């Protein structure tokens, strides 16, 4: 099934992401395709922050998840 | 805000609340939430049915019981500090002597006069509030001498001192700003921060004289010492005194609070009507029957019988009594409503706190709130005695004013409460008591994406203390269902933002009959208003700040669409400039954000730099790894090995402070002299308003130590070693070590033989040292990043950032941070006051009555704005919708262009032709969101490549997305040939 | 919506492009992203061209556009990431009235006349004010190493 | 055509004597108030005798007599 993936720059570019596959192996590919440092922004659905040690099944990633990232840091 | 002087007096005060009907319950609830120490209730009358439509504490099972005793349990449960007791005797002099405030809510004129005389005799502040249908009444008498100590809802002023000279006037000049215009002659000022003029600090406050060109003076300063630089000048408030006439005297010559003269006349008519109602109650024993024509005639006859000489003789009325007003008030004076109760209870509790804390200007003995507009219009059918007759349901209080038909219309509704923080919770209480969606054909919905916090539950009644963590939506839904058992709340956790447009779209917004948005931001309010305009839904919006409040209704096609303050909406999420961060935080706010972002970049990124990035794929060969390691590692100690020493000491805190202020300022001075610019040579002004000095730490001063403590505690918490609060013993330890720096001056700067390090002279030795430190940290324990948490005081975030900001501002001569700037900061925000929250909730409840009533003219609706500190309340009918026009096309901010697609989906050419002919407009730009579809300056080849296609296919080709399954319309923004850069054409709804 | 204003601005500026800016383009997919080739006048930047990327947030014109030098450029107040500290872009001098044309003119002025008042690269600003000869050396090297060929 | 001196009241218990004309506009009054108080025009409105003031009408329609207090009301965001 299709899950809405969006970028903070105004382009969605939905990608094939499934629950049967780990979220890390998909977010790494998305970050590589985009070209922006992952540490700049944390992917987050419905307002739940994602951690390096956080099971996704506890929070229950909904289909068509409202996943978006928030810009942080101060590069310049 | 939370002022310790006033709060000390708040807890030590005792207030009696007699006549605990719905209004008394509202007043007592607000007092308990605000934190009044003791609360003696008094209402021995048995609970009736009509008390269940306005009072939330009493339930259906509390029938035939004393209202005070029944409400005592819930009122005590609301806040445990408040000691809510119940008095079962009678109001006697001995009882009245002990209390500090006495509030008679909905009591007869006899008891009002008796208790008012008794209280005014000795020392007791007295209030007498009463709601009779849709008209309220408040009287406040605070004795013959009541001294308020802070007559404004504003922090004392402060201004940066530029220079002061000596002489007979002692004229001093200050930096340009709004404070220059704010300051006025005859005021009183004090001084606390100044370099030079040593004993002028802590001196007596003194007057000033305002001269032209923003010239001020203090007096005689010639005898004093030399002045170097000026920190700040602070204004001082002047305590005011008020004398209030007693009740028996003021009842004859009322002094109403109003913002006009016609409103004063209206309030005089209302006061005559209330006196007539009291005289009727004394002459007949029973209140006027619900909407009884006979009783209304008797009441108006009594109003005429009331002495025309009872009015003031120095200003005759332009017209005799308003028979229509008195008759309507008498007719609707049967039941008691929930929104009106909330509004009057909010105002009465604010007055009680005014009396208790001797703060803010008190009410001038009379206030009358008129909300008769909620009644049906002249043409429509006014409710009859037959349907206003009580039946036995909980809503018979509302029925006796509005009618069973209106009650059923309220019952059969679907609404959407977006946001349930504080105004949302009180709007939920109002909805539950009113009966909005309590039937089987109706319902409710609560949308919230937050979780209850210990800071939020402080002044909120729906949320308890055992619910910290559970969703606000779910808790508020449970509370509302507990309040009204027949209600059907559907808590939703997903927020209302552009990302969540697939959940809350078409199918969702098709069932809702209205929207009530109690939000805490401007962008969210603008988005919700945009959705409500797109779906043509009524919207009720409230907003509070301190004692300010605003309540507005935006009914489609009758009232102006909600427009947000775009400036503030952008300011909500906007980065700050970096020039002030680097070299000139001209104000305490820039030095505050510098401290915040410096701490963020030094700690949050430290966690990722020690382990993740270094150990995953990169090394020091990245863009600049040595700089990132230098900004965190050496400043926190040489380390380079696993630290076996305790992570709670002062050895590295002082070195960090040296590098943060003294070394930084010295390095800046070496970069350029404070008085000259090397490139300029001979500039227009040599060193204009910039003279930074390096700071030396003093162990005695509190700011330096508090910064040290905060840094040490946070570093211990961050490294993971158990950190102990230094305020008991380790502060004394750092005081015991007064001179750790002289033995470690040179080596702590950089390595061992780098006095200044020149330019990139660290070399491979230092590079390898940094790499070894990175490897040691990678093999060591991982530091855990921490976020800004106001609730947890142990992290020492607010104190640390405030101390750093104060230190740097004093280094730069900037006046120190004040509490006002911290409050204005989005973080560390104070909760809204329960009084103003209840006021806006009640006003929104009245707007809900008007909305639910049905098709109503614009003049029926009212937007309200209040300020309780100044007793300034306005309720004004809103403007007509704006009418914008271009050529022959005319439109407003609500309408939309609706072009159909057709069974064969039309092409770009077809749509363009349809527009151009049907609405007579030549489109130049056709945008879908941020996707162009057809320009006019486009090359003919591009036009002939895009035009033959069809709109739905073109959107697909450009975006890369697919048409939504179940999509109904496509919104496209169109421009026109020869149109101004401001004209906003109505959105085009391509009906796919 | 800011998108219509940005489209109008780009269409207005395309018919009369400024001399220092060429191929001011944007994707129809996302019209809030302008791609441009800054062409300096004052050496050594006068040799090559630099591709920049202007991004307009949806709060425009109440939120300053973000300018980032996609091409690596040797400027005392331009970071290697391409960020720029233009005084008008900073959120203290921004007004909705000021246009992207004026912003780009100020950017050209900044590039042609290196700034030291607000150094984004304070280290290299110090090297500039000390040894401008070494600065021209590194400037020429970086221009000839990263700069895009100057179009006709 | 003669000028008058109104007293615009700031939201923090302060007043200021603005020198305006009956032929001016509420927009001009708002601009002066904004300039003096360091506030944006779209963030605040101003009211007189209860009723608010549309920023497209002359001040003469609204009955501003000399020595009048035009209150300034801020748009509130807290919820
Ligand atoms: O009472 P309060 O001022 O704290 O109100 C804040 C509440 O409003 C909710 N909120 C804020 N913004 C939104 C959006 N966009 N959608 C849904 N709810 C929203 C907060 O969660 C809080 O409960």
Residue numbers in the entry:
A (entry chain D): 82 to 157
B (entry chain A): 21 to 1012
C (entry chain C): 2 to 153
D (entry chain B): 79 to 157
What do the authors of the reporting publication say about this deposited model?
ISG15 is a ubiquitin-like protein that is activated by an E1 enzyme (Uba7) and transferred to a cognate E2 enzyme (UBE2L6) to form a UBE2L6-ISG15 intermediate that functions with E3 ligases that catalyze conjugation of ISG15 to target proteins. E1 occupies the apex of the Ub/Ubl conjugation cascade where it performs two main functions: (1) specific activation of Ub/Ubl in a two-step process that results in the formation of a thioester bond between Ub/Ubl and an E1 catalytic cysteine (adenylation and thioester bond formation) and (2) recruitment of cognate E2 enzymes followed by transfer of Ub/Ubl to an E2 catalytic cysteine (thioester transfer). While Uba1 (E1) is specific to Ub activation, ISG15 is exclusively activated by Uba7 (E1) and specifically transferred to the E2 enzyme UBE2L6. Here, we present cryo-EM structures of human Uba7 in complex with UBE2L6, ISG15 adenylate, and ISG15 thioester intermediate in a conformational state that is poised for catalysis of Uba7-UBE2L6-ISG15 thioester transfer.
The double-loaded Uba7-UBE2L6-ISG15(t)/ISG15(a) complex was prepared and imaged by single-particle cryo-electron microscopy (cryo-EM). Two reconstructions of the Uba7-UBE2L6-ISG15(t)/ISG15(a) complex were subsequently isolated, which we refer to as Form 1 and Form 2, with overall nominal resolutions of 3.38 and 3.21 Å, respectively (masked at 0.143 FSC). Both reconstructions exhibit the same overall architecture and do not appear to be functionally different, with the main difference between them being the strength of ordering of the SCCH domain, ISG15(a) NTD, and ISG15(t) CTD. Hence, we constructed a composite map and the refined coordinates derived from this map were used for descriptions of the structure below. Globally, the Uba7-UBE2L6-ISG15(t)/ISG15(a) complex exhibits a conserved architecture in both forms of the complex with the AAD, IAD, and FCCH of Uba7 engaging ISG15(a) and UBE2L6 sandwiched between the UFD and SCCH of Uba7. Consistent with the Uba7-UBE2L6-ISG15(t)/ISG15(a) complex being poised for thioester transfer, the SCCH domain of Uba7 is observed in the open conformation and the UFD adopts the proximal conformation. Density corresponding to the pyrophosphate (PPi) leaving group and Mg2+ was absent indicating that we have captured the product complex of adenylation, after PPi/Mg2+ release. While the density is modest, likely due to conformational dynamism (local resolution of 5–7 Å), the ISG15(t) CTD clearly extends away from the surface of UBE2L6 and is wedged between the UFD and SCCH domain of Uba7 (top view). Interestingly, the active site of the Uba7-UBE2L6-ISG15(t)/ISG15(a) complex represents a hybrid of the adenylation-competent open and thiolation-competent closed structures. To our surprise, ISG15(t) is located at the back of the Uba7-UBE2L6-ISG15(t)/ISG15(a) complex where it sits atop the AAD and packs against the UFD and SCCH domains.
